[PDB]
Amino acid sequence: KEVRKVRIALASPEKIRSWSYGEVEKPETINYRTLKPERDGLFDERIFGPIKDYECACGKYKRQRFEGKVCERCGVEVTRSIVRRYRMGHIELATPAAHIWFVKDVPSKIGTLLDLSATELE
Amino acid sequence: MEIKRFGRIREVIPLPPLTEIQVESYKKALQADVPPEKRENVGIQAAFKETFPIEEGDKGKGGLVLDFLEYRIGDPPFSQDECREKDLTYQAPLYARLQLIHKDTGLIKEDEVFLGHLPLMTEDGSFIINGADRVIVSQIHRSPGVYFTPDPARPGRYIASIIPLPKRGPWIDLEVEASGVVTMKVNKRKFPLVLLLRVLGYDQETLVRELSAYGDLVQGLLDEAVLAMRPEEAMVRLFTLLRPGDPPKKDKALAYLFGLLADPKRYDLGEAGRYKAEEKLGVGLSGRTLVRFEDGEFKDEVFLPTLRYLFALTAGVPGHEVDDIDHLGNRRIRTVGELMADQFRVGLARLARGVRERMVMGSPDTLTPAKLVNSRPLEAALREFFSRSQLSQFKDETNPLSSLRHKRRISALGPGGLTRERAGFDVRDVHRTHYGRICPVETPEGANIGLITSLAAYARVDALGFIRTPYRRVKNGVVTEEVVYMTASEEDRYTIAQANTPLEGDRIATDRVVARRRGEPVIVAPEEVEFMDVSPKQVFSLNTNLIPFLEHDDANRALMGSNMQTQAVPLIRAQAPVVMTGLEERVVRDSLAALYAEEDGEVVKVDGTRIAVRYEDGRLVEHPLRRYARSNQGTAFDQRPRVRVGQRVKKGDLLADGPASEEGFLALGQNVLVAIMPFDGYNFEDAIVISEELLKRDFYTSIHIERYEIEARDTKLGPERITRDIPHLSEAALRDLDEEGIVRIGAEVKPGDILVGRTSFKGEQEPSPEERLLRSIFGEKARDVKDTSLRVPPGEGGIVVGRLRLRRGDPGVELKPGVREVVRVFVAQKRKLQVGDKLANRHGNKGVVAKILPVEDMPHLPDGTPVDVILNPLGVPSRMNLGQILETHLGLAGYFLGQRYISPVFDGATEPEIKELLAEAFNLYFGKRQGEGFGVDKREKEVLARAEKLGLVSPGKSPEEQLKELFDLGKVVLYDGRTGEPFEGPIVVGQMFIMKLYHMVEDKMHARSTGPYSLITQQPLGGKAQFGGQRFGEMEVWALEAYGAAHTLQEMLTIKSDDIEGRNAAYQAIIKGEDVPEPSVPESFRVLVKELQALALDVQTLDEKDNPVDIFEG
Amino acid sequence: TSVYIEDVLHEFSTIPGVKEDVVEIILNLKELVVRFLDPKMASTTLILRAEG
Amino acid sequence: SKLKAPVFTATTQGDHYGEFVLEPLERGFGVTLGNPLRRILLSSIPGTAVTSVYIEDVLHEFSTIPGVKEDVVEIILNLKELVVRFLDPKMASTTLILRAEGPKEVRAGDFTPSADVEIMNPDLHIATLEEGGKLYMEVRVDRGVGYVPAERHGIKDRINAIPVDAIFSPVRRVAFQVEDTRLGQRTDLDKLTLRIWTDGSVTPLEALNQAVAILKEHLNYFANP
Amino acid sequence: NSLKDLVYQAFLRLGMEKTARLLDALKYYGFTLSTTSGITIGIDDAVIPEEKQRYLEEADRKLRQIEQAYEMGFLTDRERYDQVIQLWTETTEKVTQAVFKNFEENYPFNPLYVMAQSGARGNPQQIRQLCGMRGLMQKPSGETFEVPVRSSFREGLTVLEYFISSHGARKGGADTALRTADSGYLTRKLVDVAHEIVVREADCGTTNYISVPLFQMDEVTRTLRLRKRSDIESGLYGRVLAREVEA
Amino acid sequence: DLNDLYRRLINRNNRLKKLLAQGAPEIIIRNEKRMLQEAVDAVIDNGRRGSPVTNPGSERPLRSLTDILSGKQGRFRQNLLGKRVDYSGRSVIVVGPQLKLHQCGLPKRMALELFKPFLLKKMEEKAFAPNVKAARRMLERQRDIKDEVWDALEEVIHGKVVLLNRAPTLHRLGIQAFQPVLVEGQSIQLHPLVCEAFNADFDGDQMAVHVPLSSFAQAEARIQMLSAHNLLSPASGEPLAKPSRDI
C-alpha cells in the first residue's frame, strides 16, 4: 500500500533512541589518510549502513540472500551502500535540553504553556 | 577607396584624447615625474598628509610622533608582458620618508620605508592585476554642498542636507518632524538638534530671533528648558547619547571630528562644499561644518544659514526653493587615480593604528621609522582594491571599441558610496543636463539601465569631477573661434544655439534661430545669442556616434545598435562600413590595438613577426606584432602588417592594422550586399537568410582561442605530479605529448582526447554500485595511481598553438596555499557561419540566421550577380529605424559607384543628395548593360508594368526610364533564381554593413541523456566525459501542473534528478526497453522526513483508514 | 584541396619574411585556378618556392 | 559527389490528378526540375476545346433567350468544361451540331452523332429548356496549344454566332513542393512532389511525359552548330 | 481579426485535427505568397502626405497668434500654456489621420500601411512618427515642452528634437526594466493560493447563482451604457445559465 | 558545514560528562552546562540571539538544522525551484518554415546524445551491433557516424515526442510537444504560429527540450501538450496559433 497522509508527531527520548540504529556516543569521524569512520563516531559504518557495495569493512559473503550480515570483528551489516541515507544515530545526552523551537520561536511554546514570566525567566 | 565626405560645420577641434579618463587622471595622482617638494596635493600626497602629522595618545607629555616630507615612486619589479604570463599584479614598490622627533629630540630619518605595492598604470588605461587586465571604472556620486528638498514619509514638510566629501566626513540630515522639533541625524542617530545649537554658542532667545515669528516650528525646537543650559554641559548629553561607554568631559575628543579641521567633515577645499553652500545658503563659509579651536569654544558657520532656508521653505518666501538632486552641476565623478588614493586613506588607515599601539608597548628611545611600521595595510588594502571592488571590472576585449567603450563607462554602483540593486527612479532617468556630457543612448537593456553609462564624446570631467562640454562663443550676431569648455551650473543661464543652424562665412545667417536656455528649447533672435555648440557628435556617446544615419532611427532600437556594436566579434577579411562618420578611423588609434609610429622615417624589415623601421635619424626601433593572442572573452585579436618594405612614411600612420581594422578604419563587421524582402518565412519575425556565397568567400569567419588550465596540489595521499606516463592509456592516445605530459603545439585536438596528464594517488577505498557499471566507463577497476588528466571538454577543441609552464618556486611565480606547478594549453578554431549564428546592423535589427541558401536560390539581380542576405522588412516597422534602410540605398549607390561615404551625426547626406548618386550609379550601371548590347526584358517591363499601376513609377515613360525612375527610387527588379520569373514589385536592394556578435550557438547548445551525477545533492552536474545538466523551475512545474501532466510532472521530479534508485533503475530500464520507471517513493520525501527527525518530530504516515506506514523498508 | 609550408604546424602560423600569415596565404590559394588538360588526371600536387 | 538514382513512384487516380513522387535529389534540383516542368504543363500542350458558338435565335452574349432558362453567357462556360478528342491524325478543326427540342435537359452527348470525333464527357448540364425550346448549335472546335483568349483570334465561322475562350489546355492545374527527406547522415535532400489535375482528356501521366519530351527536344537545340 | 474568427470558427464546426492543417497551409500558402508578391521597404515608400506643409504651415501660424495674443493680456500664463499644447496635439492628430486618408486614396498597397491595416506589423501610432511626424514629448517629470517634433523619421530628425524625444525610450525602458525583474511576483503568491482548486466534481449541486452586470454605471456622469464588446465575452463566455432567460 | 556543529555539540557533552564523574566544583558545573544548550542551540538554530558560531578563522555563520530546512532551497522550496533533468538539452532556436505545426527541430548532433538509450537497444534488436554495451562502443568512436545508424535514430523517434520551453515559461503553453525531426545546422528549428505563446522571439533566444520515458508521460504530453492539440488560450478562449506578422 502507498501513502495517503503525513502526520508530524513530536520527538520522544525513548523513540529518538529507538531509531539511531547505532549510538554515536562517540568522538569525531573521518580519517583522510585512510578513508574510514573512526572506531565508532560520525561515520562508523558498523552502526549505519556499508559505505561500499554490500560488503563489510573486512569482507564477507556479499550474497544477495540469507538476510542478516555481520561478523567476528566486523559487524557491518551487509545491505547495500545507499541506506547510509536514512539510518540515524544518537548522542544520549548528559542531562537536560531545549529544542529552541519551544524557547525562542515566536510565542515561546514553553514559556507559555507554563507561564514562566514569558521570557527572561526561561 | 575613393572617399566623399558630407556636410560641413568644421569640427573646431578633433575629439578629446579619449583614454584621457584613465591616464590623464592617474598621472596627475601619482606624480613621480615632478620634484617631491612640489606636488600640489590630491592622490598619494593629500593621503600621506591627511594622516601624517600622526601623534601619539597623550598630547604633549611622552614623546613619539612620526611625520612626512616627500614620497618616492617605485620602479617595475617586472615588465608588462611577464607580469602577465607569470600571474603578477604589475605593481611597483612604493617608499616613503619618515622621521620622528621624540620629546627629548632626535632627527632620525629612516631612508625610505616600504609601505606597499602600488600598481602602475598602462599606456592603455587598464592595469595588470594578478594576471589579466581590469578597468578601474569611473563612478558618479552626489556632489557635496546643501540643498534641503521635501520630506518623504511626511508630505508638506521639508528636510535639510549637509553632504561633505565621502570617506572624509559624516552624513548629516536636519529633518523636521511632527513633534515640532528639528532633530539631528548623524551616523545612525536621531537626537534633539537643540543640543547642538547650544554647543556652537547659541542661547534661549537667539534661536527664536533669527528664525521665529515666521514658522512657529521654533516653539517645538524651544521648550526643552532642561537642555537650554550651559556650554561644556550640552557636551555630555551629546557624548552620552552619540557615543555610549564613556562619560568624560573629553567630549571634544570625539565632538572634534564632525566639525573643525578636515579629519572627517568638509565638502572639498571650499569648492562644491563652500562655493555652493555660499550662493544658496547665507553666504560666507570656508571649509568644514563650523570651526573649533578659535579662542576657546565653537563658533558656528553652517548649521544656521541652512536652518534659514529649510523653515522659510516650510512657509517661506522667494529665492528659497528645492534643489534638483540629479543635476550634473549637482553631480560628481570619481576618476581613477583618486579611487586608489581613497584606498590609501584606507591603506594609510589600518596603518595609523598599527603604530599608535606600537608606541605604547615598545621602548620610546629604541624607536626609529622602519621598525614601527609593518606595511601590510597598504598592500592588503590597496591590493584588495584591484582584486575585488565591484568597480574593478574585467575588460571587454571583444573588439577594440568595446575595450575603450568600457573605459568611458560611468557607474552609480560602488563599494559603499553608491547605489544598491533596488532604487533609482529619480536618477536612472536621463536629465536636462546630460546634453553633451553623458550620452543618453548607451546604457544597458535592463537590470541596470540608467545607473551605468558612457561619456558624451567631447565632454571632459575636471577639477572636482564636474563634467564640462564644449561650446563656441559669439560676439552677439558675429562668430568667434574661441571655444568654451564649461560646467553645467555654468550652462543653466546661457541661451545656447544649435550648430545645425545656418552660418555664413563665420557668423549668423538668418533671423529664425533655434536655441535653448537652461534646458528649455526655444527659438531666438540672431544676436540674442550667447554661444553655440561645436557640433552634434558633442552630444552622443562615443560609439553611439559610429551610427551612420542615426538621423533616421527610433531612439530605443538605437542604443541597441550603439550597443551590440560592442558585443561585436572580429573576423579575418574584415571591412569598414561603406557608410562611415569619420571618427571611424580615429577610434582605431586611441584604442592603441593598432600600431603607429612616433616619428616619421621609413620601413626596412617587414614580416608577420615584426616591423623594423629607421625613423628620421632617430635610430631604428622595431616593434613586434602580437600574433594570435587571447582576449578575455576569448575573441582572439591579432595586429597585421599593412605597409611595404620601402617608402617614406607620413609622421606616424598605420604601421600595420589591429584585429577588426582595415588600414586605420574600424571594421566591426562586413558591409555586404543585401536584399530587403520576405522569403519563404525564412527570416520570419526577426530571422535572416544567407547565401552559401559568404562561406565560399569565407566572408563571415571568426577566430577564437579557448584557454584551458590545471592545478596540481600537495596531499596526504601523496603529491600530484604530471607526466606523459599514465596507465592503461594506449599509446595511440598519449601519441601527441612530446613535452612529457603536455600536448605539443600544432596538434589537432578532439574531445576526450588528452591535453594534460596529471596523476594523483588517492583511493584507500573500493568502488561498489552506481559507479561500476559506469566506472569501466572510467576505470577497469583500476590502478595505484589514477588518470585524472585534463582531456578536452565536450564539443570545444581546435588546433593548439600555445603552452605555458610554471612550478611553485620560479622567480616571480607565486602559487596559492597547497598548489604546485601550473599549466595552460592554448588551442583555437575557424568558425565561419553556422545556421543560427547571431548578427545585426548598427541600426538595431539584431537578427540570427536559419537558412544558409545555395547561390542557386538567392534572388539575384538581372545582371547575374546574386544578393547575400535577405533582410525581411517586417522587422523594421514597429521599430523606427529608417536609416538602416537608408544605408542600403547608399549601398547600391556605393556599389556601381565604387566608393565609400561618411554621413556623420545629423550631418549625413540627404534624400535629394542621394537620389543624385543613386541615379549617378544607374547611368553607369546601365551604361554597362546597354553597352553590352541588351536593354531590359519581358521580366523587367512586366514589373514596371505594375510598378506604375502602383504609382511608384511615373506613367507614360519608356520602359527604360520607369527603371531609372524606380532605380533611383532605391529599389529594382529581382529574379528568384529558383523560378525564372522575377519578383513582382521593385525591391529595395543595396550594400548593408553588418557584424558577427559575441554569441555563436557553437558555445551554447547541449544535450544529456545521462552522465555525471553529482555526489553532493545526488543529481546531474558538471561533466567530465559526456556533458551538461539542464535545470527546471517552478514555472515549468505549475504549467506542468497546468496540464494534467501527472507523471510528466513526477518523472520530471525523480528519475531525472535526486531519487538515486530510479535514475539507475530507469537508466537500466531502457538498456532493455521496459516500462522503465515507477519509482517506489521519491527520494526527497524520505530525505526530508529524515532531515526532520534529524531535528525531532516523528513525521509519521497513514492512509485512508489511518494506519502505520513503512516509508523506508530499511 | 590542401597545402604545406616549411616550418608550419598549423593554419594559425607565421613565417619569418612573410607579411602574410597562413590565412593571408591560404585565402590567396583557395582562389587560384588550374587547368587539368588530361582526363586521366584524378589529381596532382603543385609546388612553389621562394628565395632572398 | 556520389548519391544514387531517384525513386519514381506515382499514386494515380484514373483520369484526373496524379501524385507523382521522385525522392533522391541533391540540393536545388528540386526546384530546378519542377518549376520549368510546371511552366510547360500549363503552357504548350496538345488539346482541344470550343472556338465558336452559333445559337439560332439572337446574336450577342448580352441578349435574351425565349424558351430557354439560362442565358448565352452560361452555355458558354458550360461549353468550356466540355471536352472532345480527335480520332483523325491530322484534322485540326471540326464543326458540331446541337439540336434542341421542347421540354428537356441538354446533355453534352446529345451532340450530333458523327463518328470521326469523340465526346469525352457525355454528361454536362449544358442547358435546359421550357415548352417548345429551340436550340440549333453550330459549335466550332479547334486543335489548339495552350490558352488563347476569345479576344485575340476573332473567330469567323458564321455571322450571328459568338467566338469564345479556348481552354484547350488539358493541363488544368499543376502544383508542386520541394520538401526535403533524409538518407544517411544527410537530411536536406530534395524531395519533389508533383500534382497535375486534368480533365477526362489526356492522363496527367502523359501530361508529364509529353512535357519532358518537349522540354527534352527543347534542349537538343543547344547543340553545337 | 478576420481569419482569427475563421480560425476559431473553423475549429468550432471542425475537429482540432483539421483546424491545424488550416492553420498550417495558411502559414505556407501565405508565406510563399507573401513573397511571390515581392513587397519591400524603399524609404520612398515611407510616404509623407502633401498636406504636411499646409498643416504644419497653418498650425505654425496659430502660434504667432497666441503669443501675440499673450503680448497684451488676453491669456494668463496658464490659459496660455494649455493652448500651445492642446494646439500641436490637435494638429498632430491631423498629421496622423491625414497621411492616412491619402494612404487609402493613393498607394493603398504601400508597404507600411497595408501591414498596419492587415495584421503584419504597425499600429495606428508608430506609422506616424515615420511619415508625418512625432509630436510633443513627456518631460522627465511628466511635463511636456511647448516645443514640438516637426520632423518625422523619414526625415533626419534634428539635434534637439532627439535630445527631448529620447527620454521616452528609457523612461519607457524602465518599464521593460523593473517590469521584467519581479519574476512572476504576482504569479507566485497567486499560485500558492488556488493550487488546490480543481475540477473535483460535476455540479456542486447548488441552486445559488450570480447576477451578471451588462450595463455599466458610470460612477461619474452616472449616465448609463452597456459594456464594450470583449468584456462581456469574458464575463459570459462559456458561463452556465442559472435561471433560464426569455428574449 | 552542519557537521562542524554536531561537533562541539559532542565536544561539550564530553568535557562536562567528565566534570561530574569527578570534581564537583559547583560554580564550574554551571559555567559548563551553560554550553550544553548553546551547543544544541547553535546546531539547531545557530543564528539566534546575537552570537553566531565562529569557526576558528572565518566569520561565516555556518548553517544549522534550522537553516538547512529553511528553504532558500531548504528541502521544502528546493523542489518547486529547480532540480536538474537527466534527459535534457537546450539551444538557440530558428525558423521551421517547412516544419508542419506539430513537427519540430532537433539537429542530429544533440538529437542523438539526447536519446543514447533507446537507440542502443533498438540497435541490438536490429541485425546490427551484437551486444548492448558492445553497441555503446560504436557511437563513441569520436565522431563521423555510419549510415545504417541514423536510419535507426529515426525509426527511433517516429512516434515519441519532446517538450519545449522558452526562458521565462509562464503558461501551460510555455511548453509543448512535437514529433521532432532530424535536421542540419546545430540550432533548433521551431514552427511559426507557436511563437506567440512563448512570445517566441528570434534574436538568438533559446528554448529547452525535455524527454519523457514513461509510456505514460509521453502519452500525457501529445494528448495534452501538443501545440497542435492546444490552439487556444484558456487565458481568454481565443486563438493563439493565430497566423500573423507576415502570413
Report the 3 state secondary structure along B489-552.
CCCCCCCCECCCCCCCCCECCCCCEEEEECCEEEEECCCCCCCCECCCCCCCCCHHHCCCCHHH
Q: Of B830, B863, B891, which marks where a domain is finished?
A: B830
What cell does B113 get? 620605508
Q: How many domains does chain B have?
A: 7
Cell 611577464 -> residue: B82
Cell 599514465 -> residue: B726
Per DSSP bridges, beta strands B513-517 and B466-468 are unpaired
Phi and psi angles of residue B3, each rounded to the nearest 5 degrees, phi first: -105, 120
User: Which residues of chain F lie closer than 8 angstroms to A98, CB-CB?
Assistant: 37, 40-41
Contact B836, F92 (CB under 8 A): yes
- β-partners of residue D10 are D20
What cell does B214 get? 515666521
Cell 606600537 -> residue: B358
Burial class (CB in 10 A: 0-12, 13-18, 19+), B1102: middle
Three-class SS state of B1049:
helix
**CA-wise closest residue to B585 among B14, B13, B7:** B14
CA atoms within 13 A on the CB side of C28: 6
CA-only gyration radius of chain E, Å: 26
**CA-wise closest residue to B227 among B197, B247, B205, B200:** B197
- DSSP state at residue B460: E
CA distances from D107 to B549, B829, D57, F147 (A): 71, 77, 20, 61
What span, in angstroms and rounded, lies between the C-alpha atoms of D79 and D50? 7
Per DSSP bridges, beta strands F90-95 and F188-190 are parallel
Per DSSP bridges, beta strands F177-180 and F103-104 are parallel
Please state, as a whole number, how many other Cβ atoms lie within 10 Å of the Cβ of residue D93: 12
- B793, B856: one domain: no
The alpha carbon of residue C40 is apart from the nearest alpha carbon of chain B, in Å, by 28
**D2-30 as b/e: b if 16+ CB within 10 A:** eeeebeeeeeeeeebebebebbbbebbbb
**CA-wise closest residue to B221 among B249, B185, B196:** B196
> CATH 3.30.1360.10 in chain D, residues?
4-46+169-222
Per DSSP bridges, beta strands B869-870 and E224-226 are unpaired
Touching chains A and E? (3+ Cβ pairs < 8 A): no
Beta carbons within 8 Å of F188's beta carbon, 6+ residues apart: F91, F92, F93, F94, F104, F105, F106, F107, F206, F207, F209
- β-partners of residue F226 are F177
Nearest to E184 among F170, F239, F241 (CB): F170
Contact E65, E87 (CB under 8 A): no
User: Which residues of chain F lie closer than 8 angstroms to E121, CB-CB?
Assistant: 245
Beta carbons within 8 Å of A22's beta carbon, 6+ residues apart: A40, A44, A46, A47, A48, A87, A89, A90
Touching chains F and B? (3+ Cβ pairs < 8 A): yes
What span, in angstroms and rounded, lies between the C-alpha atoms of B769 and E191? 41
Range of the domain at B604: 593-667
- B172, B262: one domain: yes
The alpha carbon of residue B1006 is apart from the nearest alpha carbon of chain D, in Å, by 19
What span, in angstroms and rounded, lies between the C-alpha atoms of E169 and B437? 19
What span, in angstroms and rounded, lies between the C-alpha atoms of B829 and B847? 24
Contact B316, B285 (CB under 8 A): no
Helix axes B1083-1093, B1060-1072, angle to 10 degrees: 160
Best B834, B1048, B1060, B1083 member to test F by mutation, with max F CBs in 10 Å, is B1048
Beta carbons within 8 Å of E107's beta carbon, 6+ residues apart: B950, B951, E47, E113
The alpha carbon of residue B593 is apart from the nearest alpha carbon of chain C, in Å, by 18
> DSSP readout, chain F?
--HHHHHHHHHHHHHHHHHTTS---HHHHHHHHHHHHHHHHHHHHTT-TT-----SS-------HHHHHSSSSSTTTTTTT--B-SSB-EEEEEE-SSS-TTEE---HHHHHHTTHHHHHHHHHTSSSSSSHHHHHTGGGSSS---TTHHHHHHHHHTT--EEEE-SS--SGGGS-EEEE---SSSSEEE-TGGGGTTT---SS-EEEEE---SHHHHHHHHHHHBTTT--EEGGGTEESS---TT-
What span, in angstroms and rounded, lies between the C-alpha atoms of F216 and B1051? 9
User: Which residues of chain B lie closer than 8 angstroms to A32, CB-CB?
Assistant: 716-717
- For chain B, the residue count is 1114
- β-partners of residue B517 are B520
What secondary structure, in 3-state letters, does chain D show?
Answer: CCCCCCCEEEEECCCCCEEEEECCCCCCHHHHHHHHHHHHHCCCCCCEEECEECCCCCCCCCCCCCCECCCHHHHHHHHHHCCEEECCCCCCEEEEEECCCCCECCCCCCECCCCCEEECCCCCCCCCECCCCCCCCEEEEEECCCCECCCCCCCCCCCCCEECCECCCCEEEEEEEEEEECCCCCCCEEEEEEEEEECCCCCHHHHHHHHHHHHHHCCCCCCCC
Cell 568624560 -> residue: B248
CA atoms within 13 A on the CB side of B518: 2
- The letter for the amino acid at D172 is R
Contact F246, B678 (CB under 8 A): yes
What cell does B153 get? 514619509
- β-partners of residue B507 are B478
- B961, B911: one domain: yes
Contact F174, B1039 (CB under 8 A): yes
User: Which residues of chain E lie closer than 8 angstroms to B449, CB-CB?
Assistant: 170, 173-174, 177
What span, in angstroms and rounded, lies between the C-alpha atoms of B820 and B808? 5
Please state, as a whole number, how many other Cβ atoms lie within 10 Å of the Cβ of residue B158: 22
What cell does B1044 get? 494534467
Q: Topology of D4-46+169-222 in CATH?
A: Gyrase A; domain 2 (3.30.1360)
The CATH code of the domain that includes B436 is 3.90.1100.10
Best E14, E27, E37, E123 member to test F by mutation, with max F CBs in 10 Å, is E27
Tell me, yes or no, if E160 comes closer than 8 A to chain B by beta carbon.
yes
Three-class SS state of B361:
helix
- B985, B1089: one domain: no
- Pick left, alpha or beta for residue F81 (phi over 0 → left; psi -120 to 50 → alpha; otherwise beta): alpha
Beta carbons within 8 Å of D179's beta carbon, 6+ residues apart: D191, D193, F98
Q: Of B491, B512, B535, which marks where a domain is finished?
A: B535
The CATH code of the domain that includes B660 is 2.40.50.100
- B660, B792: one domain: no
CA atoms within 13 A on the CB side of E35: 24
What span, in angstroms and rounded, lies between the C-alpha atoms of F182 and F162? 13
What cell does B929 get? 548593360
What span, in angstroms and rounded, lies between the C-alpha atoms of B899 and F110? 45
**B652-677 as b/e: b if 16+ CB within 10 A:** eebbbbbbbbbebbbbbbbbbbbbbb
What cell does B906 get? 545629423
Contact B656, B834 (CB under 8 A): no
Contact F164, F208 (CB under 8 A): yes
**CA-wise closest residue to B652 among B710, B709, B601:** B601
What cell does B788 get? 585524472
What span, in angstroms and rounded, lies between the C-alpha atoms of B69 and B49? 9
**CA-wise closest residue to B1087 among F79, C18, D153:** F79
What cell does B447 get? 537590470
- B794, B920: one domain: no
- The letter for the amino acid at B790 is L
The alpha carbon of residue F98 is apart from the nearest alpha carbon of chain E, in Å, by 8
- B401, B491: one domain: no
Tell me, yes or no, if D215 comes closer than 8 A to chain B by beta carbon.
no
What span, in angstroms and rounded, lies between the C-alpha atoms of B1071 and B1062? 14
What span, in angstroms and rounded, lies between the C-alpha atoms of B336 and F161? 57
> DSSP readout, B917-971?
HHHHHHHHHHHHHHHHT----HHHHHHHHHHHHTTSSPSSS-HHHHHHHHHHTT-
- B461, B520: one domain: no
CA distances from B1081 to A5, A78, A119 (A): 13, 23, 43
Scan residues 32-51 of C and list those with Cβ closer than 8 Å to B: none
What cell does B372 get? 614601527
What span, in angstroms and rounded, lies between the C-alpha atoms of A23 and A19? 9
What span, in angstroms and rounded, lies between the C-alpha atoms of A110 and A122? 9
Burial class (CB in 10 A: 0-12, 13-18, 19+), B95: middle
- DSSP state at residue B691: E
Cα dihedral B484/B486/B492/B495 (nearest 10): 10
In chain E, what is the greatest distance between 2 CA atoms, to the nearest angstrom?
A: 78
What span, in angstroms and rounded, lies between the C-alpha atoms of B534 and B483? 8
Helix (H) or strand (E) holding B696: helix B693-696
- B309, B363: one domain: no
CA atoms within 13 A on the CB side of F47: 11
Burial class (CB in 10 A: 0-12, 13-18, 19+), A107: exposed
Tell me, yes or no, if B773 comes closer than 8 A to chain F by beta carbon.
no
Nearest CA in chain B to C19: B607
Q: Of B535, B553, B573, which marks where a domain is finished?
A: B535
Helix axes E52-64, E77-105, angle to 10 degrees: 170
- B152, B287: one domain: yes
User: CA B1051, B1056, B1061 angle in degrees (round to 5)?
Assistant: 90
Cα dihedral D142/D147/D150/D154 (nearest 10): -60
**A28-63 as b/e: b if 16+ CB within 10 A:** bbeeeeeebbeebbbbbbbbbbbbbbbbbbeebeee
Phi and psi angles of residue E86, each rounded to the nearest 5 degrees, phi first: -55, 0
What span, in angstroms and rounded, lies between the C-alpha atoms of B1059 and A81? 14
Q: Edge-to-edge strand order for the sheet containing B848-853?
A: B848-853, B687-691, B869-870, B672-675, B989-992
DSSP alpha helices (H): ranges in chain E? 2-12, 16-25, 31-36, 52-64, 77-105, 111-117, 124-130, 159-165, 167-171, 175-181, 186-194, 229-236
Phi and psi angles of residue E206, each rounded to the nearest 5 degrees, phi first: -65, 145
- The letter for the amino acid at B215 is G
Cell 461549353 -> residue: D79
In chain B, what is the greatest distance between 2 CA atoms, to the nearest angstrom?
A: 112
What cell does B178 get? 511632527
Burial class (CB in 10 A: 0-12, 13-18, 19+), B933: exposed
- β-partners of residue D148 are D166
Query: Resolution reached, in Å?
Result: 5.0
Chain breaks in chain E (C to N over 2.5 A) after: none
A110 marked among binding-site residues: no
- B166, B287: one domain: yes
Contact F188, F94 (CB under 8 A): yes
Which homologous superfamily is D47-168 in? DNA-directed RNA polymerase, insert domain (2.170.120.12)
User: Which residues of chain B lie closer than 8 angstroms to E40, CB-CB?
Assistant: 676-677, 873, 971, 985-988
What span, in angstroms and rounded, lies between the C-alpha atoms of B287 and B260? 9
What secondary structure, in 3-state letters, does B228-241 show?
Answer: CCCCCCCCCCCCCC
> CATH 2.170.120.12 in chain D, residues?
47-168
What cell does B768 get? 561498489
- β-partners of residue F239 are F232
Cα B1084–chain centre separation? 42
What span, in angstroms and rounded, lies between the C-alpha atoms of F87 and F92? 18
- B262, B174: one domain: yes
What span, in angstroms and rounded, lies between the C-alpha atoms of E149 and E159? 11
CA distances from D7 to A86, B923, D221, F152 (A): 63, 51, 29, 21
- DSSP state at residue B431: -
Contact B496, B515 (CB under 8 A): yes
- Pick left, alpha or beta for residue B740 (phi over 0 → left; psi -120 to 50 → alpha; otherwise beta): left
User: CA F87, F93, F97 angle in degrees (round to 5)?
Assistant: 120
What span, in angstroms and rounded, lies between the C-alpha atoms of B705 and B827? 6
